[PDB]
Write a protein that binds this ligand. Structure first.
Ligand code: M7U
Ligand code: M7U
Ligand code: TLG
Ligand code: TLG
Ligand code: K
Ligand code: K
Lengths: 413, 413
């Protein structure tokens, strides 16, 4: 049973939404990426000078989420819930505000952590004033399923609301489980993707003490260099992204025009190390291969891989080996974190949206900063200008601390 | 496609482990439940008198996790990671330390929040001493997939390590997803269940300010009264629990004796309110119905329901309606939170283990404190003494804030 042999129903992507450091409008982000734009800038936040942080660069959203939030939203939701509400409404409107059967409608939204600012706020309030200063809303704002639950309540989803957490693969893992929910017959339509918090001092300190972050502060747009010989770690770039997926039958019955097909998904784990990927890429390549088995594709069918490509020395080398293991190392490769940075729990969902746009429009944007090939890598990294083609099938990769490997196989509609 | 019709492979439970407020030994917890024991006591923690907390009752683990941990693990793992390492090693030993194929072995472990004490710790450290005082291990201890990832690394699981977060249904949801992973062909064997943090002052304040908790401080063992007319909210009782599931042919091949069969799982959502269950019980009933459809059972086959039964007024009334919607209201009902209290992200896993032991041993423990029947409930609540019977099929219910409904259908082996 595969998508190609009709063992699974055909599942299509019928709407996308994202907010990024380039634009709040996904179509404008996409045009910016194709024009070689970067969302990364010097950080001007007072927290950078307060703490004299070693990292002084990153991409805040172009259009801050809270400029769209009312007084009560700011007091009743954590930041990732507010992002989830903003994007869920935008996605539904982009889909034509369909009146779907709530009992066949699921939501699957990943995030790295949850409403953690409300944990530190509640802690401070109780230390200063005692237990009765904690909000009656604290639990529901903090719980990591909070953003998915807000979207499910907002949009009326009664076929399940799920939150897989797998660190930096959470946003792709969510789209994998939404596809599973549909092909298993538990839903006909799902909103899925990932949301994440903004850049702040404590997140920068924690990842900096792992020695995982770029410190190329003098040239912020040049700092994120996935697959490049001179890379020196990742750069934060804020985002959130959701997509609407549904059976092809369901889309046809309501007149939705698909953007792409979501053909299959593979999830594996390394059992190697908690915070470094296995150098051999074997289990990561097996997640890619499993997505092909469930799609009914061979590796030679894959015209494009949207790489997780964080720009760490270790991570990019492992992913290049994984792509080789899966037989996909003659695909054209894009590493979007070169322009958009790393949004942790959201980023797999953002990069799945970009993989969809590559299939819809026949173009891969250039990987920024790809100037000096690294002989360990040996991939067809698209650089300098966009790569045009009749792309038929593509894989999006995402990986996370914990050893999680997620691959999603998409096709042109 | 159902378990009964052979459309899904047969999946069996081959080992269980749990630590509770009654015992660290699940067989002793089980004997204690049957004897009418309660794990709930007056809280003697200094934090109760420090804050003059309204809630002064709960069940700490009989044997603290950290009596088994050294200072190095106590500094380099969060508490839920330490609980997961302790339980995962105990489970694997109980299973006979099998040499399974890593590439066919998955882990699915839910939790409500994650390594949140390390969030407030890192915040305090940075406020006192700057960003370079944050631990280089802080991210991997905080991330909510951390416990599942520790277990996956410890035991060698390469077929996926998943953490579904759905608040108080997370422990059951994890078992649901592990069953899906096996029946979809991505694993032959899985460790699954849930872990959760201990009772502490800030968790008590947050839930207390929801007005959800019992304050029957005078008579701690009498406080948790699921389905009783005089119930007044839930009581914390610490736990963590894991089970080993595997295909029946994998169990046979290694000579493992099954404890029970895991036949099907249903997940739905309410889209009603963030922290109140839908009064009609309709979507929660449909999670039970879905687990029967995938099992290949009818409601008339069900002998036993292990209720989520938190002892809130509105919660138990909605669940009674859900059990009626599913046609399961002739079954014998147990509410284990009456004795063990509520362990949040672990509790659905704990109660799945108890459902397995009910089928294995042909006995349901008494629901403690069930003294005055409530006309809105109208269920056969087992009480007073344990009830012996030839139980063949049981459903375990769990629900969570966000409107999450999970039902698991188990059978006697
Ligand atoms: C692309 C970035 C991704 C970062 C990913 C981090 C993961 C979670 C990020 C959650 C942060 C949400 C912050 C939103 C609210 C906000 O902004 O509040 C500022 C004031 O600062 C704060 O309250 C800071 C509160 C910090 C909360 C605790 C963060 C703990 C971080 C860990 C120690 C390290 C990261 C763990 C990641 C684990 C999961 C992924 C592997 C404006 O305040 P005001 O002036 O308007 O009053
Ligand atoms: C059955 C209870 C379930 C409760 C579940 C609630 C969530 C669990 C969160 C994990 C808590 C782990 C605590 C382990 C370490 C420990 O205990 O450290 C104490 C000292 O206290 C602390 O550091 C407390 C640290 C507080 C951490 C933040 C807690 C935030 C809680 C939220 C405001 C409210 C709950 C949100 C739940 C959302 C998910 C479920 C809906 C001994 O110190 P020492 O003797 O070693 O010196
Ligand atoms: C098991 C550890 C893995 C997969 C680590 C990666 C490559 S994932 C990721 O997103 C990332 C960074 C630093 O962003 C990694 O270092
Ligand atoms: C949508 C909200 C739900 C399901 C609420 C429940 C009944 S679940 C649970 O575990 C619980 C408590 C207080 O423990 C609830 O109040
Ligand atoms: K990618
Ligand atoms: K239960």
């Amino acid at each position: 049973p595969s998508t190609a042999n009709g063992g699974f129903p055909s599942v299509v992507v019928t709407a996308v939404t994202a907010t990024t450091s380039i634009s709040p409008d996904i179509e404008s982000t996409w045009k910016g990426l194709l024009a070689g734009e970067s969302g990364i800038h010097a950080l001007e936040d007072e927290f950078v000078t307060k703490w004299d942080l070693a990292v002084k660069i990153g991409g805040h959203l172009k259009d801050p989420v809270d400029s769209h939030m009312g007084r009560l939203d700011m007091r009743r939701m954590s930041y990732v819930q507010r992002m989830g509400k903003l994007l869920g409404g935008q996605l539904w409107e982009s889909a034509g505000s369909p009146e779907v059967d709530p009992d066949r409608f699921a939501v699957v939204v990943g995030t790295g952590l949850g409403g953690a600012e409300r944990i530190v706020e509640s802690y401070d309030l109780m230390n200063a004033g005692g237990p009765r200063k904690v909000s009656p809303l604290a639990v529901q704002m903090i719980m990591p399923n909070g953003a998915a639950a807000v979207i499910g309540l907002q949009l009326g989803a009664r076929a399940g609301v799920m939150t897989p957490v797998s660190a930096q693969s959470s946003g792709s893992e969510a789209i994998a489980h939404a596809w599973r929910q549909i092909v298993m017959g538990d839903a006909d339509v799902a909103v899925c993707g990932g949301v994440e918090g903004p850049i702040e001092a404590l997140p920068i300190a924690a990842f900096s003490m792992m020695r995982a972050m770029s410190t190329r502060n003098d040239e912020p747009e040049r700092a994120s260099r996935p697959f490049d010989k001179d890379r020196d770690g990742f750069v934060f770039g804020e985002a959130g992204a959701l997509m609407l997926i549904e059976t092809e039958e369901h889309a046809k019955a309501r007149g939705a025009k698909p953007l792409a097909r979501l053909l299959g998904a593979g999830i594996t784990s390394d059992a190697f190390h908690m915070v470094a990927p296995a150098a051999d890429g074997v289990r990561a390549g097996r997640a890619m291969t499993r997505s092909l088995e469930l799609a009914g594709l061979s590796p030679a069918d894959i015209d494009h891989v949207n790489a997780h490509g964080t720009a760490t020395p270790i991570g990019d080398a492992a992913e290049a080996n994984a792509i080789r293991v899966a037989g996909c190392d003659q695909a054209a490769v894009y590493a979007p974190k070169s322009a958009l940075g790393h949004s942790i729990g959201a980023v797999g969902a953002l990069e799945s949206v970009l993989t969809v746009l590559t299939l819809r429009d026949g173009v891969i944007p250039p990987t920024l900063n790809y100037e000096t090939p690294d002989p360990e890598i040996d991939l067809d990294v698209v650089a300098g200008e966009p790569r045009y083609g009749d792309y038929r099938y593509a894989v999006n990769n995402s990986f996370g601390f914990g050893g999680h490997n997620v691959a999603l196989a998409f096709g042109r509609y």
